[PDB]
Design a protein around this ligand. Structure first.
Ligand SMILES: *C(=O)CCCCCCCCCCCCC
Ligand SMILES: *C(=O)CCCCCCCCCCCCC
Ligand SMILES: *C(=O)CCCCCCCCCCCCC
Ligand SMILES: *C(=O)CCCCCCCCCCCCC
Ligand SMILES: *C(=O)CCCCCCCCCCCCC
Ligand SMILES: *C(=O)CCCCCCCCCCCCC
Ligand SMILES: [Cl-]
Ligand SMILES: [Cl-]
Ligand SMILES: [Zn+2]
Ligand SMILES: [Zn+2]
Lengths: 21, 29, 29, 21, 21, 29, 29, 21, 29, 21, 29, 21
């Protein structure tokens, strides 16, 4: 999940892209 | 954990800017 | 358009607060 | 959608709840 | 106070209602 | 504690959305 | 009205920063 | 109030201080 | 002017996210 | 500057990158 | 450290409001 | 740097002024 990946480690912009529709 | 809520409120705006017209889904649970 | 982008920026934050654990799907126009 | 409605009129908490999963 | 109740424990929307005028 | 300041900045927006026309008061001390 | 709501959303954040420990009362029009 | 003034003209830090407790 | 101030408020946040470690210089009109 | 361009048209991620150090 | 990123996102808006027409520079590294 | 001064200790508004152009 996004909470367990992007908030316990800093996510780069691309790592945010994975949750886009 | 309130810190989780704070970062989640930063994650939604990060998804909003990144996705744009595509849209995003936020599913912590 | 820009002001719609601004309102959507606040709209996702409002949705994040109101929904909470349930989450939401944000689809723009 | 959400942009068409809530960005033209102020949405009440129940209306925001309609967009929740 | 609000700092000692809503920030050391996650407050639901209703718990935010208590501080409204 | 800076973390206190960050959550307080999230608390004011939570009160703003919740209260609306009624208004809110923020009194940490 | 919506754009007033948007400005008030940024207005409370600006007041929170400027005031600090003193706090403030936010009464809308 | 605060909305009538600062949302029609940019408010300087002293004007924002006027709303502090 | 106010709405330009509002867009710049979101503009700096967008720049902060996009740039990251590099940083940026924000010069208004 | 940044205000003149991106506050009149939506700026793409590359355009925002142009303002990075 | 994500907490560093969160406060930095609060620091940029603090600089934006404080500086205004002068502008600000954000250089963590 | 700003990260080592204003985020590990709460900075007052004036402490934010130092990083203005
Ligand atoms: C639902 O609660 C999501 C499940 C995973 C939650 C992880 C919470 C971890 C605690 C916070 C650690 C990082 C603090 C910035
Ligand atoms: C995306 O293209 C947005 C679609 C909605 C149309 C926006 C404009 C509708 C009329 C507003 C005019 C006010 C601005 C001068
Ligand atoms: C004035 O300083 C308010 C009095 C209560 C302050 C409590 C601060 C507790 C430290 C933060 C703990 C939680 C971190 C997210
Ligand atoms: C609440 O009802 C707001 C009261 C203030 C009136 C807002 C409109 C004043 C004139 C603005 C017109 C510009 C929008 C077309
Ligand atoms: C600072 O003075 C801003 C300079 C840019 C001018 C803003 C107005 C340009 C035309 C917009 C008119 C729409 C508002 C009625
Ligand atoms: C680049 O990484 C900046 C160098 C200094 C970083 C300090 C990070 C300290 C860890 C966070 C401590 C405070 C948490 C609110
Ligand atoms: Cl935060
Ligand atoms: Cl706005
Ligand atoms: Zn935050
Ligand atoms: Zn805004």
């Amino acid at each position: 999940g996004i909470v367990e990946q992007c908030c316990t480690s800093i996510c780069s912009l691309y790592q945010l892209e994975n949750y886009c529709n | 954990f309130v810190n989780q809520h704070l970062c989640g409120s930063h994650l939604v705006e990060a998804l909003y800017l990144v996705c744009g017209e595509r849209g995003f889904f936020y599913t912590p649970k």
